[PDB]
Every structure is written in structure tokens, then in C-alpha cells.
Design a protein around this ligand. Structure first.
Ligand SMILES: NC(=O)C1=CN([C@@H]2O[C@H](COP(=O)(O)OP(=O)(O)OC[C@H]3O[C@@H](n4cnc5c(N)ncnc54)[C@H](OP(=O)(O)O)[C@@H]3O)[C@@H](O)[C@H]2O)C=CC1
Ligand SMILES: NC(=O)C1=CN([C@@H]2O[C@H](COP(=O)(O)OP(=O)(O)OC[C@H]3O[C@@H](n4cnc5c(N)ncnc54)[C@H](OP(=O)(O)O)[C@@H]3O)[C@@H](O)[C@H]2O)C=CC1
Ligand SMILES: CC1(C)N=C(N)N=C(N)N1OCCCOc1cc(Cl)c(Cl)cc1Cl
Ligand SMILES: CC1(C)N=C(N)N=C(N)N1OCCCOc1cc(Cl)c(Cl)cc1Cl
Ligand SMILES: O=c1ccn([C@H]2C[C@H](O)[C@@H](COP(=O)(O)O)O2)c(=O)[nH]1
Ligand SMILES: O=c1ccn([C@H]2C[C@H](O)[C@@H](COP(=O)(O)O)O2)c(=O)[nH]1
Lengths: 221, 326, 326, 221
């Protein structure tokens, strides 16, 4: 079992975290660390109104594919283990998160949408929009499909388990440099297991600055 | 078409064999810094210059006796429309540099004005011993001479003492560049210069920020500041912030939006006693930058007060004392 | 590792489209220029800046009425120990700029001295009409005022007329920098400044080469020159040559070897009437550079004469008349 | 349609040319062009005393090989020949006069497979580990039998001239020596329709002269 799933099925996580109100019960003078950016959502929605730049990024990363690199990945998956004229990525999201998305954007265009739910039923749905009972079934659905990469879009429960069961190869983390109130957060990334390998330029979008960083799984056991 | 891949190797045939060790630097000294693949955050423009000097700098002595590692000629550019470039790999305070800037604008040369507000940036430069070393024996303590402020508002006026009245004496460069920016924006003569050759010896010390040049396009203001001597470890972080704040001030009073702050470094050096502290800093990963907000009610360069400035969302690593003896 | 390759693509998610590029450039206008795979010849630092301005410059009017395409802030570096950077993509002659440089060193402000050697660089700036336009009604024709030479040898002296004796008046910056380079080489204050704010209006025209700062290491001399306004098509080629030659002269009289000539450009512009001539020049491939030889017996900055300079092996493309109307 | 010999066997030319000492016609306004650099030799040896930087570049280029890229070049050569599927080295070809101008201490050229063209001399005339060929067609036969990375034609002029004429040169690694010397042999005038410059290097000073390196590539015409 030294053939890791995430490296075979290239399972990635992409999120955006803001800063969270100190609850008014913090001490004297503040300290910062990567955990400072952990706010994920508030009452079923995103903590902030709308940050178009992060939207544009998320879309670009989840819908980008390089066909001249697929065969090599095909070659990798089968060995391990016409339909669609265009190759695509698989986006795994939880029901809550699925419900949060608006109407005109579902299912996410140019993407193979998947949903984790123990309650939903495949039928009143599109034959084109898969669904699964548990994380383990996903690996099976991936085994059948022809896809470039698989992106775990949240939410929190989703992130926690996928991180727990260690199915994440990289984390495309957006650091939103502003405070909002949240009720759901992102897990505290362990440094011994994930390390930042890339940091982008800094931008301003909808009255807040933000940057994009990338965490990569550490090969140290 | 890897054809041209070998060609790239050929053009590098005369490269230096770094297998040769230089400046007593240990590989792992920069383990984390060198572990990142893409370092696009703007703070790396500052960090990469420090790394370059540490790895390829020239060992030299200097006026202070501490000795340094130095290189000559660099340029950094910060996009003020997207962030306020206050370094995040160490903690920085701004009250003091903002008061220094307001003091420059008032055209003052009295060091006591800063000391009474607990801003000690110029304290050492105004002591009896420091002035006597500069051979300014007849200069009162903290009377800095015709430095920045005096040149910005009275270039060419004869300096007497810090309490004299210089109203309407000399060239008011600050007033002139503001008028040029408002009325003749495409002028290529919009410069503010502190290097008055005639007055250098009367100054507690010759200026480091020689000049500031401005450029206006599509309602946006950019500024280039040329610094002849740059203490990368301690001075530069504050210099970037001072001139970025100044650019916002000028832009605002001229009804323009700030665009880029361009910093040109002449003698760029790392003091031998800052080496350990900088090795630590370079291995820290930048956080997204904060933003700077100015009270929109201020319409004239002379009306800004300390409460008119606000730095928001400043996320930073812990402070670092650059001094090995610190 | 090819995964970092997809990451590279993500970082470019917000990059500009193609038809967002701002100017009217036809694809084939730079076909040869864009056909080259590796453009490492140092002349490309110059050619690449012109290209950057043509493709991304800002359209603006200017004092001359011709209008330009411009950008703010660039830096070029030339290694004088390996070659003399005289542009090869067009023919350049250096007799006049060398006579100009000797005229500056002598501290002269008399335009007739240059006309008598058949050098017309300053002819237009000294006519009756030009001076009257600057409101210099009481200035004799060809009396340029306190320009470069005057500032280099007498900064701060009161200017009277081009025939006066200014011995021992004002600050002799030139002698001062030579002394600092010889006796305090690690000084970070070795600067020569031409921008005397108080005398600007008395000059036939304000200076474009604001200052020169020197750097000395291991017996080698480097020089940074800051140019506030740069006519890329006509002025810059000669400016690079002039200061490269000046660096060789200063180095020689101080028993040092020249190292780098670093050119900082503030308002860099390409005049609208030079666009067709530059499109042609950019498609020409540079030739290896010539070398500059100075008579070795000259040991003092003031003893050079035109016959002490020789340019060897200058290979170049045909002369170009930058002006569209020319 | 079908393959060109120079592409299958990767045959390149490498040379160094100075300016030629013509001495009295109207030199203050002389005209320059690529042909300005054409001086190759004098009295059987090089026109110049010694330009070490060019010797260094020459050695670096002619000895460099990339083993990971070889497994592919092999496939290409086999396929072209319809044949099936020690330390790797480049092949260097030189005329008899050129070979004779090289000092004993440098022959045969280190880390390279040496090949000499000659009709007057035979293998019995050489004590060295070199291949002797008496026809250009024989080089191709040889290349078809050896395991090598790239093939560099080293001059002299008679050799450069026939390889360009037979169009067996894929690229020309040309050093422009910026100084004048007496010469008696010249590099052939390159046709701009057949070859175009694709790269130019930094400029250097070596042994009292400046020089640069350019690369001409065969065109799509
Ligand atoms: N900042 C960011 O980048 C993102 C923020 N968010 C925010 O977070 C919020 C949602 O967060 P959160 O409450 O954590 O929930 P999630 O949205 O992650 O997931 C909830 C759903 O996941 C399903 N689920 C959970 N575990 C499993 C499992 N093991 N197998 C199968 N299905 C499973 C549930 O199905 P059911 O109950 O039917 O059984 C449930 O409806 C929103 O406010 C959203 O806007 C969301 C994505 C990204
Ligand atoms: N500047 C540079 O980069 C270089 C300069 N040179 C200089 O050029 C000079 C040599 O020039 P050059 O005189 O033209 O001679 P070459 O080095 O080109 O040798 C030509 C001779 O080599 C043999 N030869 C050539 N073609 C064939 C063929 N097709 N079949 C069989 N034998 C062949 C013959 O040898 P034989 O008569 O035995 O039969 C012929 O006489 C020297 O001065 C040398 O220093 C040389 C290389 C590079
Ligand atoms: C947070 C967001 C986008 N950004 C990053 N980097 N990472 C994510 N996992 N993203 O969200 C995916 C799930 C929510 O998608 C939407 C939610 C809303 Cl509310 C709207 Cl309007 C449109 C969309 Cl597509
Ligand atoms: C000119 C040289 C080297 N440089 C380039 N770029 N291209 C060449 N084809 N070169 O010559 C190769 C054949 C001659 O080699 C030598 C000739 C002499 Cl005379 C001496 Cl002393 C030593 C050597 Cl290795
Ligand atoms: O705003 C400032 C003022 C000073 N310095 C540094 C540069 C030098 O290390 C020292 C001044 O010394 P001299 O360059 O004048 O010798 O202070 C800065 O970096 N920034
Ligand atoms: O040595 C020189 C002198 C002048 N100029 C150019 C720059 C401007 O195009 C014009 C001077 O006009 P103002 O910048 O002063 O407007 O001349 C140069 O490039 N180099």
C-alpha cells in the first residue's frame, strides 16, 4: 500500500479562509501564524459578501486541464487500480456546500460534479451529476471516469475527513486578509505533514487584500 | 523542440563554479527560503536583494567600522493600488516615521520637536558629541541644520539656527511639485531634491533619500525615490513605508490615485552584525500585506495630522532585533 | 516534476489578454526581433526597453508638443571591463560628446567654445529666441547659464556671465569625488549632482542627467547615473556612451579599473516621430561591441584632450535618421 | 515528406571567424554585414595567437551530451534506418589540414569520437584512436553505426564549404572575433534564405579582443 490514492487520483483541496473575530476575549497584544486564516463560512454561506478575484481563481484552477498530460495519468491509474469530447476535472463537494451554490451556476460548468450525501437520491437529479454515500465510494467512481484532476471544494466536514483519511495531495489556499464572523472553520494544517511551497502576488479585490498560497504534502512519513 | 534546450546550456559555459564557497554561508542557512518554488509575493523583492548581497556581496569596511556586505544598484517596485508594502516578515511600527514625515513637510530642523513626541529617529544625530564630530561646534544640541525639511521648503536660503523665521526664503520645492502635478502633469521636471551640495557640511548628516521624482498618467501618480545609501536590515523597511505613505499623501491632495512607488538603491548594504537576524527573517514566509487609509477630508499637504492615518489588517511575524548585541 | 507546471498556469489566472495591450502595433512590425530565441547581447537592455514602451507605453503629450509613448523607471547595466557599450544597431559618432564632456570638466558655460570645434549639441539652446523664451533677456547668445560644468566645479557660486573668473567659488564637486575615490573609497557619499534647485531657472534648460554616484571595490570603479528624462530614440544612446567614457576617465585618474556603468531611467519616452525608425532598428541584430582606449599617460581629470581617446573595432549597422520628417 | 540527413544524425558546424585585413580602399565609411566576420585561417593555422574564451566555448559545446535525451535520438535514427530498437559522446569531424594544425598534446580531442577526412592519408598513417574516412557519404554510413549524441563539423574551409553545399548542416555555432588579422582561408558566405540567426550571446573580452557567439539555424524555405 505504498501506492497512494491521492497521488494516483491526484486529489486536491481548494479553499479560501478569512480571519476570525477574536470573540472579544483575547489577551493584551496579538500574535499571528498560518492558523490566523481559518474562517470558512457562516450559517451556510461564505463569511464575506463577494470577492470576485477569488471566484475567478477558483474557477480557473478547478476547470483547467492539460490534455497532453492526461495519457500519462491514464497510464498511471489503470495500472494501479468519444464519450466526453472534452477532458474534465472532478469537483467533490458536500451537500451543504452544494446547496449554498446559487442556481445559475450549478452544476459548475466544464466540471464533473459529485456530491457527498447520505440522504440525497440520484434520480430527481441529472444522470450527469453523480452522488456518493461515502468517501470510499468516490475512489471507485474515479476509477471508472476519465478525468484530469479531482478537487475537493469543501465544506468543513468534507475537508476534515478528506484530510484525516489523508486523501489530499495539495491545498490551494486563498488567504483573505480581513475579518468576518464565522461558525465553520478549516482544520489546523499540521506543519509536519503539509508545507507551503508557493506564494503569489498580493491583490486587492472588493475592499480587501488577499494572496494565494499552495501547501504540498510532505514526504516524511 | 528541445533543440534550443542544449543551446541554453552552451550560453552558460562561462558561468562561475559556485562549488566554490563564498561569504561563509551554510546551505541550510536558507533552507526554507530556497524550498519555495514560486515566490511572487512583493516582499520577496526586498528579501531577494538581501539574499543576493549575502550570497554575492562584497566585504567592505564603512564609515561606522562594523563592516558590511554590499552591492551597487537595485530597483524595487510596489503596486500601491493593490496593497501597502509594510514588511510582514518582522514587526514594524509607523507612528514615528509618520511624525518624521509631517515634520519634514513643516520644513522643520528642530530635533526637539520629535523628541517631545517620543520619536527618537534623529536623537543620536543631534547630540553634542555627534555635532562636534561633524565639526559643528557652534551648533545647539538637536539643531540638525539644513536637512530634508529645510531643503523641501527653503532650498537655497541661508541657514542660521533652528528657531529662525524662514517664511518665503529659498525655493519651496514641495509647493512647486504639487502645482506641477496639478497643472502640468506631463512635465518631466517634477522632482523634489534634498541633496543641496552647498549645505551638506552644515547638515548633522548628508541625506540618504536624495530625490523623489513623480509621474502622472490616467489620473494616477507614481513616484521614484533614489537612495544613495541603504541599510537593508534596518533602514530600508522604514524607507519603503515612508515614501509609500508620502506618495499616497501627494496623490490625495492632487485628486489622483496612487499607482507605483519605485525604490532605486545605490550603495545597498547588509551590516555584518545583522547577518544572523537576516538569516532568520529570510526563512519566514510573507503574509498578505495590509492597506493604508487616509482621512479623505485632508485636501492640502500641510493639513495632515497623525490621526489622519490608519493601517488596516496588518498581519506579521514577531519582531526581530537586527543587532547581534541586541 | 511537472506538477509545479500547472501551478505556474494558476498563478497567471489574472494575466492580461492580448487585445488589451494598449498600442497600435502590427504583428510583423517586430518579426525579426521576435524571431530570436536568446537575446543576451547587452544592446538588448536598450532595445528591450524601447520594445516595452512601444507595446505597453502610455500615450501622453509633452513639453515639445510632439507627444510620446512613455514608462517610468528602468535600469540598464553595462560591464565596462568586457566592452564599451556603443550601440551597433545604428551608427554613432563620439567626437562631439567627448568634446562636450571635456567642456563640462573645464567648468565652462560658453556655447561658443563648442561651436568653434564644430560641435552643435548646445546650439539650439543658446539662441537669442531660445533664451528669451526662458525669460533670459539679459543673457548673451550662447551664454548657457549655470549648467553642468558650472555645477560640477562651482556649485553654489552666484552666476554672473560665461566669461567671469569663478576660481575658488562654489563647491568643486569634481575634485571632491576624485579625492574621495582615492582616499575614502568605501564612502557612500561619492556623488556628483547637477540639479541645483536654486539655479534651475537661470539655466538655458534644466539638466537631464541629475547625478552620478560612484562605488569602489577591489580596485574597481562602478558608476550609477540617474536620468530624469530620457529620449530613447536620440538621447539615451549618446548618454550611455558619455557616462561610460566618463567612468573610464575617473577610474584611470584614480588608478582603478572600470567595472560597471549603471543607468537609471526615470521618465523614459519614445517620441511619436521616432516610431518608424525604431521599428526598423529593433529588427537589426547587434554586432559585438567596440572597445575604448585612453592614453595611459593622463593622470589628472583636467589633462585629457580629444586626441587621448580612441574607439577600436566599432562594427555597426547603417546610420538612421530618427526623425520621421528628417 | 521524408527526413533530411542533418536532422536524423544531428550534424552541426562550429567555427570562429575574425574580420579580414583588407587594407586600403575607403575605410572611415566602410559598410558592415554578417560577411564582415569571415576570416578562418592563415598559413595552415589560426589567424590569431590565442583566444582562450573561444577555446573554452568550443570545448564545452563539442563535449556536452545529455544522456536522458539520447534514448529518443536512438529511436529516430533506428526508425530512419529501418533497423530495430562506454560513456556517451559526440562525434567531431575535421579535415586533414585542420587535424594537422592541432597540437599533439590535444589529439585526439578528449571525450569526443574523432573523425578525419582525407584521401592522401589512410588509417595506417595514424597511431591515434581516430576514424579515417575518404568520402562524406562514409560519415553518414559511420554515424549509422555508432552510438553518439551529436555530430560537429569542425572545419577547415574546404570541409565547411562541402557540408553547406550538400546541405548537411542543421545549425552553425559561430563565434564572431571582433578584431582584424591576416587570413588566407575564409568561411563560405552564408545565404540568409537558407540560414537565419536565432540566438546571440553576451559580449566578452578575451586576450585583448571582444567577441560574441551567435547561432544560425537552417530555415523553413
Ligand atoms: N471558504 C471556502 O473555501 C468554502 C466555504 N464553504 C462554506 O462552509 C459551509 C458548509 O460547511 P460544513 O457544515 O462543514 O459542510 P459541507 O458542506 O462540507 O458538507 C455537508 C454535507 O456533507 C455530507 N457529508 C459529510 N460527511 C460525509 C461522508 N463521510 N460521506 C458522505 N457525505 C458526507 C452531508 O450529507 P447529508 O447531511 O445529506 O447526509 C452534508 O449535507 C457553507 O457556509 C459554505 O459557504 C464551503 C466550501 C468552501
Ligand atoms: N577559425 C576556425 O574556426 C577554424 C579554422 N581552421 C583553419 O582553416 C585551415 C584549414 O583550412 P583548409 O585548408 O580548407 O583545409 P581543411 O581543414 O578543410 O582540409 C581539407 C583537406 O581535408 C581532406 N578532405 C576534405 N573534404 C574531403 C572529402 N570530401 N573526402 C576526402 N577528404 C576530404 C582533404 O585531405 P587530403 O588532401 O589529405 O586528402 C582536403 O585536402 C587552417 O588554417 C585551420 O587553422 C580549421 C578549423 C576551424
Ligand atoms: C470559496 C471558493 C469560491 N473559493 C475557493 N478558493 N475555494 C472554494 N472551495 N470555493 O467555493 C466552492 C464552493 C462554493 O462555490 C460558490 C459559492 C457561492 Cl455563494 C457563489 Cl455566488 C458561487 C460559487 Cl461557484
Ligand atoms: C577555432 C575553434 C577552436 N573555435 C571554434 N569556435 N570552432 C572551431 N571549429 N575551432 O577549431 C576546431 C579545430 C581546431 O582546434 C585547434 C586548433 C589550434 Cl591551431 C590549436 Cl593551438 C588548438 C585546437 Cl583544439
Ligand atoms: O533613511 C535612512 C537613513 C540612513 N540609512 C542608513 C544608510 C547608512 O548605513 C547610514 C548612513 O551612513 P552614510 O551612508 O552617510 O555613511 O544610515 C538608511 O538606510 N535609511
Ligand atoms: O542628455 C540628454 C539631454 C536631453 N534628453 C532629452 C529628454 C527630453 O526628451 C528632452 C528634455 O526635455 P525636458 O525633459 O526637460 O522636458 O531631451 C536626453 O534624453 N538626454
Amino acid at each position: 500500500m505504498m501506492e497512494q490514492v491521492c497521488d494516483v487520483f491526484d486529489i486536491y483541496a481548494i479553499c479560501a479562509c478569512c480571519k476570525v473575530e477574536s470573540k472579544n476575549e483575547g489577551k493584551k497584544n496579538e500574535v499571528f501564524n498560518n492558523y490566523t486564516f481559518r474562517g470558512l463560512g457562516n450559517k451556510g454561506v461564505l463569511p464575506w459578501k463577494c470577492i470576485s478575484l477569488d471566484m475567478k481563481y477558483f474557477r480557473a484552477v478547478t476547470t483547467y486541464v492539460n490534455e497532453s498530460k492526461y495519457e500519462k495519468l491514464k497510464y498511471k491509474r489503470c495500472k494501479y487500480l468519444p464519450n466526453s469530447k472534452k477532458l474534465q476535472n472532478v469537483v467533490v463537494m458536500g451537500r451543504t456546500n452544494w446547496e449554498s451554490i446559487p442556481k445559475k451556476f450549478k452544476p459548475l460548468s466544464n466540471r464533473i460534479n459529485v456530491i457527498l450525501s447520505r440522504t440525497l437520491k440520484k434520480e430527481d437529479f441529472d444522470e450527469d451529476v453523480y452522488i456518493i454515500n461515502k468517501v470510499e465510494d468516490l475512489i471507485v467512481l474515479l476509477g471508472k471516469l476519465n478525468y484530469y484532476k479531482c478537487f475537493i471544494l469543501g465544506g468543513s466536514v468534507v475537508y476534515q475527513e478528506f484530510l484525516e483519511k489523508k486523501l489530499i495531495k495539495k491545498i490551494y489556499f486563498t488567504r483573505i486578509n480581513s475579518t468576518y464572523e464565522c461558525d465553520v472553520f478549516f482544520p489546523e494544517i499540521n506543519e509536519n505533514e503539509y508545507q507551503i511551497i508557493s506564494v503569489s502576488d498580493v491583490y486587492t479585490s472588493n475592499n480587501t487584500t488577499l494572496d494565494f498560497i499552495i501547501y504540498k504534502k510532505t514526504n516524511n512519513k | 523542440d528541445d533543440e534550443e534546450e542544449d543551446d541554453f546550456v552552451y550560453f552558460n559555459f562561462n558561468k562561475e563554479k559556485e562549488e566554490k564557497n563564498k561569504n561563509s554561508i551554510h546551505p541550510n542557512d536558507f533552507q526554507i527560503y530556497n524550498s519555495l518554488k514560486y515566490k511572487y509575493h512583493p516582499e520577496y523583492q526586498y528579501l531577494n536583494i538581501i539574499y543576493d548581497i549575502m550570497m554575492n556581496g562584497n566585504k567592505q569596511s564603512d564609515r561606522t567600522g562594523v563592516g558590511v556586505l554590499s552591492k551597487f544598484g537595485y530597483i524595487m517596485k510596489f503596486d500601491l493600488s493593490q496593497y501597502f508594502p509594510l514588511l510582514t516578515t518582522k514587526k514594524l511600527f509607523l507612528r514615528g516615521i509618520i511624525e518624521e514625515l509631517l515634520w519634514f513637510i513643516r520644513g522643520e530642523t528642530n530635533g526637539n520637536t520629535l523628541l517631545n513626541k517620543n520619536v527618537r529617529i534623529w536623537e543620536a544625530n543631534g547630540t553634542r558629541e555627534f555635532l562636534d564630530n561633524r565639526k559643528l561646534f557652534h551648533r545647539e544640541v538637536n539643531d540638525l541644520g539644513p536637512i530634508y525639511g529645510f531643503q523641501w521648503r527653503h532650498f537655497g536660503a541661508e541657514y542660521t539656527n533652528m528657531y529662525d523665521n524662514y517664511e518665503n526664503k529659498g525655493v519651496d520645492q514641495l509647493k512647486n511639485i504639487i502645482n506641477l502635478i496639478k497643472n502640468d502633469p506631463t512635465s518631466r521636471r517634477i522632482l523634489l531634491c534634498a541633496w543641496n551640495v552647498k549645505d551638506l557640511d552644515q547638515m548633522a548628516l548628508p541625506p540618504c533619500h536624495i530625490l523623489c521624482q513623480f509621474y502622472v498618467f490616467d489620473g494616477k501618480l507614481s513616484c521614484i525615490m533614489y537612495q544613495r545609501s541603504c541599510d537593508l536590515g534596518l533602514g530600508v523597511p522604514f524607507n519603503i513605508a515612508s515614501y509609500s505613505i508620502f506618495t499616497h499623501m501627494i496623490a490625495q491632495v492632487c485628486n489622483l490615485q496612487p499607482a507605483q512607488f519605485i525604490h532605486v538603491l545605490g550603495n545597498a548594504h547588509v551590516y555584518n552584525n545583522h547577518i544572523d537576524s537576516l538569516k532568520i527573517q529570510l526563512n519566514r514566509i510573507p503574509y498578505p500585506f495590509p492597506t493604508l487609509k487616509l482621512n479623505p477630508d485632508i485636501k492640502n499637504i500641510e493639513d495632515f495630522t497623525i490621526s489622519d492615518f490608519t493601517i488596516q489588517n496588518y498581519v506579521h511575524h514577531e519582531k526581530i532585533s537586527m543587532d547581534m548585541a541586541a
